[PDB]
Amino acid sequence: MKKIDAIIKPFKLDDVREALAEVGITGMTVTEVKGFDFLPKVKIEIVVPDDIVDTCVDTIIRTAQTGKIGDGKIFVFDVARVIRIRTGEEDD
Amino acid sequence: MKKIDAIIKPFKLDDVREALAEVGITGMTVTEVKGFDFLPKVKIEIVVPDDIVDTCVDTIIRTAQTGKIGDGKIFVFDVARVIRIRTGEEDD
Amino acid sequence: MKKIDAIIKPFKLDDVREALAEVGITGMTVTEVKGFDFLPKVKIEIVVPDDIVDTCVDTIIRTAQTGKIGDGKIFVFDVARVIRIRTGEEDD
Ligand SMILES: Nc1ncnc2c1ncn2[C@@H]1O[C@H](COP(=O)(O)OP(=O)(O)OP(=O)(O)O)[C@@H](O)[C@H]1O
Ligand SMILES: Nc1ncnc2c1ncn2[C@@H]1O[C@H](COP(=O)(O)OP(=O)(O)OP(=O)(O)O)[C@@H](O)[C@H]1O
Ligand SMILES: Nc1ncnc2c1ncn2[C@@H]1O[C@H](COP(=O)(O)OP(=O)(O)OP(=O)(O)O)[C@@H](O)[C@H]1O
Ligand SMILES: [Mg+2]
Ligand SMILES: [Mg+2]
Ligand SMILES: [Mg+2]
């Protein structure tokens, strides 16, 4: 699986959530951050299966972009293990 | 080494800290986050040696779980380098 | 590219920003975090080309250190993909 970090404009969060939900991604973690005096941003983190990474990245690009400055970046990371606390089950 | 991200219920932080301290892990970084309208969560990040990753994951699972919905996830990442700012010493 | 996470004392942020700007690094994401009852810290995240990782790490070490306790750590991660939301262009 991969972790996708998207740093976006705060008012683009509901756009991105809505569009991701359409391609079936709903679980996400959101952090308030400062982007560099600074601009408030939100950091979206979602961990998804490898075969939907492209769909997710593309979806975030399409929805979060304004064509203007400050639209933000997407960072994708390899994830070694994913464990559910409820059950102890590993990876997904 | 590995970085362990645990997204948990906020009132489970002291449980997890206490239990980790028992197996000798005390250094951690904590972030307030929103989990998906949303529920407040805390993100615990700890960077540990490879041979205690299992112990830590298991400890977090045992302490943070409620058997119910919302218990959260653990994400484990490879860490390329770990440097101490005090001394410049690399990895651990 | 690599992602560099530096957990530092909050009043060291402008020091680090200023010094990084000198070696040409200006884009960064900053998060308020708690370091372990706890001390307020700031988490700096910057994603940089491989050949300036050493320069950046060294710069953060030199500027952020006080020689005393609590100076913090630098964690370096491999980054699979970096995508700009404005253009959809991948990696850098
Ligand atoms: N190297 C980096 N490390 C961590 N975060 C970054 C980095 N570069 C940019 N960011 C985050 O991205 C935000 C700015 O995005 P950016 O302005 O680069 O968008 P863009 O898609 O390149 O559009 P434009 O270039 O037109 O502004 C910053 O607020 C910052 O939080
Ligand atoms: N794909 C993901 N990316 C980032 N964060 C996530 C992801 N999935 C879940 N989370 C975080 O985990 C929290 C929810 O955990 P979750 O409800 O999945 O726990 P669980 O152990 O699966 O228990 P249950 O399935 O019974 O709820 C969310 O609030 C969110 O912050
Ligand atoms: N294993 C870890 N995982 C995540 N964050 C950590 C970890 N260890 C330390 N940190 C972060 O680093 C901060 C403390 O840094 P630390 O005190 O280790 O600095 P140092 O350079 O080792 O100096 P000294 O050892 O003299 O205090 C903590 O507040 C915490 O947020
Ligand atoms: Mg909107
Ligand atoms: Mg409690
Ligand atoms: Mg200062």
GROMACS .gro file of C-alpha atoms and ligand atoms in nm:
model
  372
    1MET     CA    1   0.000   0.000   0.000
    2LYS     CA    2   0.097   0.366  -0.026
    3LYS     CA    3   0.047   0.670   0.187
    4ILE     CA    4  -0.065   0.978   0.000
    5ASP     CA    5   0.002   1.317   0.162
    6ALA     CA    6  -0.175   1.605  -0.003
    7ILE     CA    7  -0.108   1.959   0.117
    8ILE     CA    8  -0.400   2.169   0.000
    9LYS     CA    9  -0.593   2.493   0.051
   10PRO     CA   10  -0.826   2.446   0.348
   11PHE     CA   11  -1.144   2.523   0.153
   12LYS     CA   12  -1.052   2.246  -0.091
   13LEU     CA   13  -1.091   1.973   0.176
   14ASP     CA   14  -1.461   1.906   0.118
   15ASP     CA   15  -1.405   1.905  -0.262
   16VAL     CA   16  -1.138   1.640  -0.227
   17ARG     CA   17  -1.330   1.433   0.027
   18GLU     CA   18  -1.636   1.432  -0.193
   19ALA     CA   19  -1.448   1.330  -0.507
   20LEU     CA   20  -1.249   1.058  -0.330
   21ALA     CA   21  -1.568   0.915  -0.185
   22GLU     CA   22  -1.689   0.870  -0.543
   23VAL     CA   23  -1.398   0.640  -0.623
   24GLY     CA   24  -1.455   0.467  -0.291
   25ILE     CA   25  -1.193   0.624  -0.064
   26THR     CA   26  -1.334   0.762   0.261
   27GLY     CA   27  -1.079   0.696   0.537
   28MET     CA   28  -0.845   0.990   0.582
   29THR     CA   29  -0.650   1.178   0.846
   30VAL     CA   30  -0.644   1.557   0.834
   31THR     CA   31  -0.394   1.792   0.996
   32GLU     CA   32  -0.389   2.172   1.017
   33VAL     CA   33  -0.046   2.292   0.899
   34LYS     CA   34   0.136   2.607   0.796
   35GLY     CA   35   0.276   2.620   0.446
   36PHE     CA   36   0.580   2.829   0.354
   37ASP     CA   37   0.466   3.475   0.598
   38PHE     CA   38   0.282   3.143   0.580
   39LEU     CA   39  -0.057   3.032   0.452
   40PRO     CA   40  -0.286   2.796   0.643
   41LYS     CA   41  -0.307   2.461   0.469
   42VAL     CA   42  -0.451   2.127   0.542
   43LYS     CA   43  -0.258   1.807   0.516
   44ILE     CA   44  -0.463   1.514   0.400
   45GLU     CA   45  -0.317   1.169   0.462
   46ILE     CA   46  -0.472   0.863   0.305
   47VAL     CA   47  -0.337   0.512   0.289
   48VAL     CA   48  -0.459   0.319  -0.011
   49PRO     CA   49  -0.394   0.001  -0.212
   50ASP     CA   50  -0.129   0.030  -0.484
   51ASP     CA   51  -0.375  -0.012  -0.770
   52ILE     CA   52  -0.584   0.292  -0.675
   53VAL     CA   53  -0.293   0.528  -0.604
   54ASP     CA   54  -0.311   0.668  -0.958
   55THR     CA   55  -0.689   0.714  -0.933
   56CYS     CA   56  -0.652   0.893  -0.603
   57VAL     CA   57  -0.367   1.115  -0.711
   58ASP     CA   58  -0.552   1.204  -1.031
   59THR     CA   59  -0.869   1.274  -0.836
   60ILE     CA   60  -0.689   1.503  -0.594
   61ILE     CA   61  -0.514   1.685  -0.879
   62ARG     CA   62  -0.845   1.742  -1.066
   63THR     CA   63  -1.039   1.863  -0.764
   64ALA     CA   64  -0.780   2.054  -0.564
   65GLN     CA   65  -0.628   2.255  -0.845
   66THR     CA   66  -0.718   2.616  -0.915
   67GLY     CA   67  -0.463   2.667  -1.192
   68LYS     CA   68  -0.309   2.934  -0.968
   69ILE     CA   69  -0.024   2.957  -0.717
   70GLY     CA   70  -0.046   2.771  -0.386
   71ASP     CA   71  -0.237   2.464  -0.505
   72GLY     CA   72   0.003   2.240  -0.313
   73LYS     CA   73   0.174   1.907  -0.356
   74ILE     CA   74   0.109   1.539  -0.328
   75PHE     CA   75   0.371   1.319  -0.170
   76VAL     CA   76   0.347   0.942  -0.199
   77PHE     CA   77   0.522   0.704   0.042
   78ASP     CA   78   0.579   0.330   0.062
   79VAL     CA   79   0.410   0.182   0.368
   80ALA     CA   80   0.578  -0.117   0.528
   81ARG     CA   81   0.290  -0.234   0.745
   82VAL     CA   82  -0.068  -0.135   0.810
   83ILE     CA   83  -0.227  -0.269   1.129
   84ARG     CA   84  -0.581  -0.230   1.257
   85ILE     CA   85  -0.592  -0.163   1.628
   86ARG     CA   86  -0.935  -0.323   1.664
   87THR     CA   87  -0.830  -0.668   1.551
   88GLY     CA   88  -0.451  -0.671   1.521
   89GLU     CA   89  -0.486  -0.766   1.153
   90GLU     CA   90  -0.186  -0.656   0.946
   91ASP     CA   91  -0.168  -0.491   0.600
   92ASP     CA   92  -0.461  -0.445   0.358
   93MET     CA   93   1.470   0.169   1.224
   94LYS     CA   94   1.098   0.215   1.165
   95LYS     CA   95   0.853   0.493   1.221
   96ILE     CA   96   0.527   0.388   1.380
   97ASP     CA   97   0.224   0.614   1.329
   98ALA     CA   98  -0.070   0.530   1.549
   99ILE     CA   99  -0.395   0.719   1.503
  100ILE     CA  100  -0.591   0.675   1.824
  101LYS     CA  101  -0.872   0.811   2.040
  102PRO     CA  102  -0.739   1.108   2.236
  103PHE     CA  103  -0.818   0.962   2.578
  104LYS     CA  104  -0.610   0.657   2.487
  105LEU     CA  105  -0.284   0.859   2.472
  106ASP     CA  106  -0.190   0.819   2.838
  107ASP     CA  107  -0.274   0.444   2.821
  108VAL     CA  108  -0.039   0.399   2.529
  109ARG     CA  109   0.236   0.616   2.673
  110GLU     CA  110   0.226   0.427   2.999
  111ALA     CA  111   0.239   0.084   2.836
  112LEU     CA  112   0.516   0.181   2.595
  113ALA     CA  113   0.722   0.316   2.882
  114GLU     CA  114   0.705  -0.033   3.035
  115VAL     CA  115   0.878  -0.183   2.733
  116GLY     CA  116   1.122   0.106   2.739
  117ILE     CA  117   0.987   0.340   2.470
  118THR     CA  118   0.937   0.697   2.589
  119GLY     CA  119   1.029   0.930   2.302
  120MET     CA  120   0.727   1.020   2.094
  121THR     CA  121   0.577   1.301   1.891
  122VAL     CA  122   0.205   1.372   1.921
  123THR     CA  123  -0.017   1.561   1.679
  124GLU     CA  124  -0.383   1.664   1.708
  125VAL     CA  125  -0.563   1.547   1.392
  126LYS     CA  126  -0.911   1.500   1.252
  127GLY     CA  127  -1.014   1.152   1.151
  128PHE     CA  128  -1.270   1.083   0.879
  129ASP     CA  129  -1.834   1.471   1.028
  130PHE     CA  130  -1.494   1.396   1.180
  131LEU     CA  131  -1.374   1.275   1.519
  132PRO     CA  132  -1.079   1.428   1.704
  133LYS     CA  133  -0.787   1.187   1.711
  134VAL     CA  134  -0.431   1.197   1.815
  135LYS     CA  135  -0.148   1.086   1.596
  136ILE     CA  136   0.136   0.926   1.784
  137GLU     CA  137   0.467   0.899   1.600
  138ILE     CA  138   0.749   0.692   1.740
  139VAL     CA  139   1.072   0.588   1.576
  140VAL     CA  140   1.211   0.265   1.710
  141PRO     CA  141   1.471  -0.006   1.636
  142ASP     CA  142   1.355  -0.285   1.405
  143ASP     CA  143   1.364  -0.553   1.675
  144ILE     CA  144   1.113  -0.377   1.900
  145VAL     CA  145   0.865  -0.279   1.627
  146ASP     CA  146   0.657  -0.592   1.694
  147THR     CA  147   0.661  -0.527   2.071
  148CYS     CA  148   0.552  -0.170   2.017
  149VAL     CA  149   0.281  -0.250   1.766
  150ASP     CA  150   0.149  -0.526   1.991
  151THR     CA  151   0.158  -0.295   2.292
  152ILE     CA  152  -0.035  -0.025   2.109
  153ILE     CA  153  -0.291  -0.277   1.984
  154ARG     CA  154  -0.348  -0.419   2.336
  155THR     CA  155  -0.380  -0.083   2.508
  156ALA     CA  156  -0.553   0.132   2.248
  157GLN     CA  157  -0.824  -0.110   2.147
  158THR     CA  158  -1.179  -0.092   2.276
  159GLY     CA  159  -1.316  -0.371   2.058
  160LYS     CA  160  -1.546  -0.107   1.907
  161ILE     CA  161  -1.549   0.119   1.601
  162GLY     CA  162  -1.296   0.402   1.570
  163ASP     CA  163  -1.001   0.234   1.743
  164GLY     CA  164  -0.771   0.353   1.465
  165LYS     CA  165  -0.476   0.225   1.268
  166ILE     CA  166  -0.106   0.176   1.295
  167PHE     CA  167   0.111   0.261   0.999
  168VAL     CA  168   0.474   0.152   0.990
  169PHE     CA  169   0.736   0.321   0.769
  170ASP     CA  170   1.097   0.254   0.675
  171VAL     CA  171   1.323   0.533   0.797
  172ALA     CA  172   1.628   0.610   0.586
  173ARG     CA  173   1.820   0.818   0.838
  174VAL     CA  174   1.778   0.933   1.195
  175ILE     CA  175   1.993   1.226   1.306
  176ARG     CA  176   2.022   1.388   1.647
  177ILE     CA  177   2.036   1.764   1.625
  178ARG     CA  178   2.237   1.792   1.946
  179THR     CA  179   2.537   1.598   1.821
  180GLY     CA  180   2.490   1.538   1.449
  181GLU     CA  181   2.510   1.162   1.513
  182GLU     CA  182   2.326   0.961   1.248
  183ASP     CA  183   2.092   0.659   1.282
  184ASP     CA  184   2.029   0.457   1.601
  185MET     CA  185   1.394   1.276  -0.343
  186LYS     CA  186   1.379   1.259   0.036
  187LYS     CA  187   1.148   1.394   0.299
  188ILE     CA  188   1.321   1.553   0.595
  189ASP     CA  189   1.126   1.577   0.921
  190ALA     CA  190   1.286   1.796   1.182
  191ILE     CA  191   1.130   1.819   1.527
  192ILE     CA  192   1.263   2.138   1.683
  193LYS     CA  193   1.208   2.401   1.952
  194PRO     CA  194   0.944   2.646   1.827
  195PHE     CA  195   1.167   2.952   1.856
  196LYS     CA  196   1.421   2.780   1.631
  197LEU     CA  197   1.184   2.783   1.329
  198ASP     CA  198   1.288   3.122   1.194
  199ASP     CA  199   1.659   3.032   1.244
  200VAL     CA  200   1.615   2.718   1.038
  201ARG     CA  201   1.403   2.883   0.771
  202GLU     CA  202   1.655   3.160   0.728
  203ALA     CA  203   1.953   2.925   0.701
  204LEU     CA  204   1.777   2.689   0.460
  205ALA     CA  205   1.682   2.981   0.239
  206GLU     CA  206   2.054   3.056   0.207
  207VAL     CA  207   2.118   2.715   0.053
  208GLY     CA  208   1.810   2.764  -0.162
  209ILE     CA  209   1.542   2.565   0.022
  210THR     CA  210   1.226   2.762   0.092
  211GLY     CA  211   0.929   2.527   0.053
  212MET     CA  212   0.833   2.368   0.382
  213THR     CA  213   0.535   2.244   0.579
  214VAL     CA  214   0.515   2.320   0.950
  215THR     CA  215   0.306   2.144   1.213
  216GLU     CA  216   0.254   2.224   1.582
  217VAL     CA  217   0.323   1.906   1.783
  218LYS     CA  218   0.378   1.788   2.137
  219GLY     CA  219   0.708   1.622   2.216
  220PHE     CA  220   0.747   1.364   2.492
  221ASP     CA  221   0.465   1.638   3.071
  222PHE     CA  222   0.532   1.743   2.712
  223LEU     CA  223   0.706   2.035   2.546
  224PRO     CA  224   0.562   2.225   2.249
  225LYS     CA  225   0.764   2.156   1.937
  226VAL     CA  226   0.736   2.230   1.575
  227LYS     CA  227   0.765   1.970   1.306
  228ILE     CA  228   0.927   2.094   0.991
  229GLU     CA  229   0.877   1.883   0.680
  230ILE     CA  230   1.075   1.951   0.366
  231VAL     CA  231   1.105   1.742   0.054
  232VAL     CA  232   1.431   1.791  -0.128
  233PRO     CA  233   1.649   1.639  -0.403
  234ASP     CA  234   1.886   1.362  -0.290
  235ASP     CA  235   2.200   1.566  -0.353
  236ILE     CA  236   2.105   1.844  -0.111
  237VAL     CA  237   1.982   1.619   0.172
  238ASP     CA  238   2.323   1.633   0.342
  239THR     CA  239   2.338   2.014   0.305
  240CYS     CA  240   1.993   2.048   0.452
  241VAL     CA  241   2.049   1.809   0.739
  242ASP     CA  242   2.380   1.978   0.819
  243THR     CA  243   2.217   2.320   0.801
  244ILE     CA  244   1.938   2.217   1.036
  245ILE     CA  245   2.186   2.061   1.280
  246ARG     CA  246   2.404   2.377   1.286
  247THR     CA  247   2.118   2.620   1.332
  248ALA     CA  248   1.875   2.429   1.550
  249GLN     CA  249   2.119   2.299   1.807
  250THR     CA  250   2.169   2.458   2.146
  251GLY     CA  251   2.410   2.196   2.278
  252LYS     CA  252   2.149   2.126   2.546
  253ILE     CA  253   1.866   1.877   2.602
  254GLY     CA  254   1.556   1.889   2.382
  255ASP     CA  255   1.721   1.996   2.056
  256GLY     CA  256   1.521   1.733   1.869
  257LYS     CA  257   1.571   1.490   1.585
  258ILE     CA  258   1.581   1.475   1.211
  259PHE     CA  259   1.412   1.188   1.034
  260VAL     CA  260   1.475   1.126   0.666
  261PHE     CA  261   1.235   0.927   0.446
  262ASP     CA  262   1.239   0.791   0.092
  263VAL     CA  263   0.967   0.952  -0.119
  264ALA     CA  264   0.814   0.739  -0.392
  265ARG     CA  265   0.642   1.014  -0.588
  266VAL     CA  266   0.610   1.389  -0.573
  267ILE     CA  267   0.324   1.544  -0.770
  268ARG     CA  268   0.234   1.909  -0.819
  269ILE     CA  269  -0.137   1.969  -0.795
  270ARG     CA  270  -0.121   2.270  -1.025
  271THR     CA  271   0.007   2.082  -1.327
  272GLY     CA  272  -0.006   1.711  -1.248
  273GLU     CA  273   0.370   1.689  -1.310
  274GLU     CA  274   0.531   1.403  -1.118
  275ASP     CA  275   0.859   1.389  -0.918
  276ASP     CA  276   1.128   1.660  -0.909
  277LIG     N1  277   0.957   2.070  -0.026
  277LIG     C1  278   0.842   2.072   0.045
  277LIG     N2  279   0.830   2.004   0.162
  277LIG     C2  280   0.716   2.005   0.235
  277LIG     N3  281   0.607   2.072   0.198
  277LIG     C3  282   0.604   2.144   0.082
  277LIG     C4  283   0.725   2.148  -0.002
  277LIG     N4  284   0.696   2.225  -0.109
  277LIG     C5  285   0.568   2.267  -0.095
  277LIG     N5  286   0.513   2.219   0.019
  277LIG     C6  287   0.375   2.248   0.063
  277LIG     O1  288   0.299   2.287  -0.052
  277LIG     C7  289   0.247   2.420  -0.035
  277LIG     C8  290   0.270   2.506  -0.158
  277LIG     O2  291   0.242   2.432  -0.275
  277LIG     P1  292   0.290   2.493  -0.414
  277LIG     O3  293   0.273   2.643  -0.399
  277LIG     O4  294   0.427   2.436  -0.441
  277LIG     O5  295   0.180   2.435  -0.519
  277LIG     P2  296   0.204   2.412  -0.677
  277LIG     O6  297   0.112   2.301  -0.722
  277LIG     O7  298   0.352   2.397  -0.703
  277LIG     O8  299   0.146   2.550  -0.740
  277LIG     P3  300   0.233   2.683  -0.768
  277LIG     O9  301   0.373   2.638  -0.806
  277LIG    O10  302   0.163   2.753  -0.882
  277LIG    O11  303   0.225   2.756  -0.636
  277LIG     C9  304   0.322   2.484   0.079
  277LIG    O12  305   0.230   2.562   0.156
  277LIG    C10  306   0.383   2.368   0.156
  277LIG    O13  307   0.311   2.342   0.277
  278LIG     N1  308  -0.655   0.517   0.474
  278LIG     C1  309  -0.629   0.597   0.580
  278LIG     N2  310  -0.537   0.697   0.574
  278LIG     C2  311  -0.510   0.777   0.679
  278LIG     N3  312  -0.571   0.764   0.798
  278LIG     C3  313  -0.664   0.668   0.819
  278LIG     C4  314  -0.699   0.577   0.709
  278LIG     N4  315  -0.793   0.492   0.755
  278LIG     C5  316  -0.817   0.525   0.885
  278LIG     N5  317  -0.740   0.629   0.923
  278LIG     C6  318  -0.743   0.690   1.058
  278LIG     O1  319  -0.796   0.593   1.149
  278LIG     C7  320  -0.916   0.642   1.211
  278LIG     C8  321  -1.028   0.540   1.209
  278LIG     O2  322  -0.976   0.412   1.242
  278LIG     P1  323  -1.071   0.286   1.215
  278LIG     O3  324  -1.211   0.336   1.244
  278LIG     O4  325  -1.036   0.236   1.077
  278LIG     O5  326  -1.024   0.181   1.330
  278LIG     P2  327  -1.037   0.020   1.319
  278LIG     O6  328  -0.928  -0.040   1.405
  278LIG     O7  329  -1.044  -0.021   1.174
  278LIG     O8  330  -1.177  -0.006   1.396
  278LIG     P3  331  -1.323  -0.012   1.326
  278LIG     O9  332  -1.303  -0.069   1.187
  278LIG    O10  333  -1.406  -0.101   1.414
  278LIG    O11  334  -1.365   0.133   1.327
  278LIG     C9  335  -0.963   0.762   1.131
  278LIG    O12  336  -1.012   0.861   1.222
  278LIG    C10  337  -0.841   0.806   1.051
  278LIG    O13  338  -0.783   0.924   1.108
  279LIG     N1  339   1.142   0.796   1.872
  279LIG     C1  340   1.084   0.914   1.842
  279LIG     N2  341   0.975   0.923   1.762
  279LIG     C2  342   0.916   1.040   1.731
  279LIG     N3  343   0.960   1.158   1.778
  279LIG     C3  344   1.068   1.165   1.860
  279LIG     C4  345   1.138   1.041   1.897
  279LIG     N4  346   1.241   1.075   1.977
  279LIG     C5  347   1.238   1.210   1.990
  279LIG     N5  348   1.136   1.264   1.920
  279LIG     C6  349   1.106   1.408   1.915
  279LIG     O1  350   1.225   1.480   1.949
  279LIG     C7  351   1.204   1.561   2.065
  279LIG     C8  352   1.315   1.546   2.167
  279LIG     O2  353   1.440   1.546   2.100
  279LIG     P1  354   1.568   1.500   2.185
  279LIG     O3  355   1.542   1.551   2.325
  279LIG     O4  356   1.584   1.351   2.160
  279LIG     O5  357   1.688   1.584   2.116
  279LIG     P2  358   1.844   1.540   2.115
  279LIG     O6  359   1.909   1.602   1.993
  279LIG     O7  360   1.855   1.391   2.134
  279LIG     O8  361   1.902   1.621   2.244
  279LIG     P3  362   1.909   1.563   2.395
  279LIG     O9  363   1.934   1.414   2.384
  279LIG    O10  364   2.024   1.636   2.459
  279LIG    O11  365   1.774   1.600   2.450
  279LIG     C9  366   1.076   1.513   2.131
  279LIG    O12  367   1.005   1.627   2.180
  279LIG    C10  368   1.003   1.436   2.024
  279LIG    O13  369   0.894   1.512   1.971
  280MG      MG  370  -1.467   2.411  -0.092
  281MG      MG  371  -0.723   0.725   2.913
  282MG      MG  372   1.457   3.219   1.705
   0.00000   0.00000   0.00000
